[PDB]
């Protein structure tokens, strides 16, 4: 039996079964592309990805699986990650379709054995979906959305944003102790003030922060047809005030029975950006576009499915505005690309090294794409790199999407 193929939405075959003049052997053209997603199926080396999760379909002549992944956007994501540990998701904000999904370091089917026998390093980890990180200031997107949706603040409400501040028996600091004095929220957000945003976190309370995070998908195993490990938040009744403050800045510091939080996946970060870009409506991401019978009939198709409306459309619009300012004039100016209006939120989070995040969307006025990035600084300094990569990848992916839409 000839096992079914795995194919991108734009028609590039990534897994196929080739008849020998003698039986069938599994072939991965573009071996190395989208490995964590395609996966594999070996007696010796085990089982992963779509080869595993769609096995009954690929097996039974098998039917073929067409992914949502766009081979061109995927290649772009992959090139952006040459030389780093980290990952990138690109997603259609109105459907939850995953147009690219890249983790680094990665691997080819040809190296698998050697990778596994050696058992050293982390190439098999999918940092889009199976690695949990402190989102840092990227999470303030949520804090802001919730503050606005609950009518606790506005973008023009003023906050004192000093270098340092005492909250709930402990201190909160802006990066490098910068005292920005009294500024409006839109600006504190854009400049990514921890002391400003902490106060809004406190104004919200734990129940609000946690419940809005859950509404964007925390606690849910995101993916209709792929595995994401859930993003974590604490039991709100267990959180201290101080912990609430830092949590709202994207820093998990709780000492309690329930998990510290937030801890996010990059996938979870995309879903937040998507929902904000999609008028507050949260979409459960997916990666299988359709299934082809052995004779090519399109036998099923995955439908987009909402996980709820996390904030009002009004709130979503205010959050988009605030994210525009991040990129036009704030921490995320390295995401700027000439000719396209890009909005987003940056993040940086901590033995000496740290990680750089970015979530964004474009075009500002009628978003059709979303990006989520983490670049792990593994001793190296990668401040502002999340934003660099994100912008660049978004713009490239937009060009590809726009050619595809008119073709
Ligand atoms: C949250 O990520 C904050 N970082 C630290 C070290 O506290 C803010 N991060 C950012 C950012 O947007 O990445 C900057 C540059 C200011 S501090």
Residue from 140, 194, 326, 345 whose mutation best tests the ligand 1 pocket (most atoms within 8 A of CB): 194
User: Which atom of ligand 1 is closest in space to residue 136's alpha carbon?
Assistant: 2
User: In which residue ranges of the chain is CATH 3.90.1310.10 found?
Assistant: 1-20+23-53+60-67+106-118+289-302
Q: What is the resolution of this structure in A?
A: 2.4
- Does ligand 1 lie within 6 Å of residue 136's CB atom? yes
Atom of ligand 1 nearest to the CA of 249: 1
The ranges of the chain annotated as CATH 3.40.710.10 are 68-105+119-288+303-407
CATH superfamily of 68-105+119-288+303-407: DD-peptidase/beta-lactamase superfamily (3.40.710.10)
This entry's atomic model was obtained through X-ray
Tokens of 100: 């690219």
**Contact (Cβ atoms closer than 8 angstroms) between residue 100 and residue 80:** no
Q: Which residue has the tokens 């890009």?
A: 342
Question: Could you tell me if 321 and 187 are in contact, meaning their C-beta atoms sit under 8 angstroms apart?
Answer: no
| CATH architecture of the domain with range 1-20+23-53+60-67+106-118+289-302 | Alpha-Beta Complex (3.90)
């Amino acid at each position: 039996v000839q096992r079914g193929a795995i194919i991108t939405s734009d028609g590039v075959t990534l897994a196929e079964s080739v008849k020998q003049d003698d039986t069938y052997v599994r072939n991965y053209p573009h071996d190395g592309m989208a490995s964590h997603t395609v996966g594999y199926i070996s007696t010796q080396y085990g089982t992963a990805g779509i080869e595993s999760s769609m096995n009954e379909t690929l097996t039974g002549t098998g039917s073929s699986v067409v992914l949502t992944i766009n081979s061109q956007m995927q290649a772009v994501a992959e090139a952006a990650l040459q030389g780093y540990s980290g990952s990138i998701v690109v997603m259609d904000p109105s459907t939850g379709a995953v147009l690219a999904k890249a983790s680094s370091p990665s691997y080819t089917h040809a190296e698998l054995g050697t990778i596994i026998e050696s058992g050293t390093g982390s190439q098999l980890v999918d940092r889009t979906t199976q690695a949990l990180y402190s989102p840092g200031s990227s999470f303030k997107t949520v804090t802001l959305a919730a503050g606005i949706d609950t009518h606790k603040t506005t973008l023009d409400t003023t906050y004192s944003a000093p270098g340092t501040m005492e909250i709930g028996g402990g201190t909160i600091h802006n990066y490098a102790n910068e005292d920005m004095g009294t500024i409006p929220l839109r600006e504190a957000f854009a400049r990514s003030s921890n002391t400003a945003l902490a106060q809004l976190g406190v104004a919200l309370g734990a129940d609000n922060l946690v419940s809005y995070a859950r509404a964007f998908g925390y606690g849910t195993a995101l993916g209709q047809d792929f595995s994401t490990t859930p993003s974590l938040m604490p039991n709100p009744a267990e959180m201290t005030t101080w912990e609430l403050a830092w949590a709202s800045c994207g820093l998990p510091v709780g000492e309690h029975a329930s998990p510290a939080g937030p801890q996010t996946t990059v996938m979870q970060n995309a879903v937040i950006a998507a929902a904000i870009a999609n008028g507050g409506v949260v979409m459960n991401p997916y990666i299988v576009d359709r299934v082809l019978s052995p004779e090519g009939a399109v036998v099923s198709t995955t439908s987009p499915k909402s996980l709820g409306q996390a904030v009002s459309a009004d709130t979503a619009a205010q959050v988009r505005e605030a994210m525009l300012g991040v990129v036009e004039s704030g921490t995320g100016m390295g995401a700027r690309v000439p000719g396209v209006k890009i909005a987003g939120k940056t993040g940086t989070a901590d033995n000496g090294n740290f990680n750089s995040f970015f979530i964004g969307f474009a075009p500002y006025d009628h978003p059709t794409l979303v990006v989520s990035v983490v670049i792990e600084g593994n001793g190296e300094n990668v401040l502002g790199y999340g934003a660099q990569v994100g912008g660049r990848v978004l713009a490239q992916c937009l060009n590809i999407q726009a050619l595809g839409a008119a073709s």
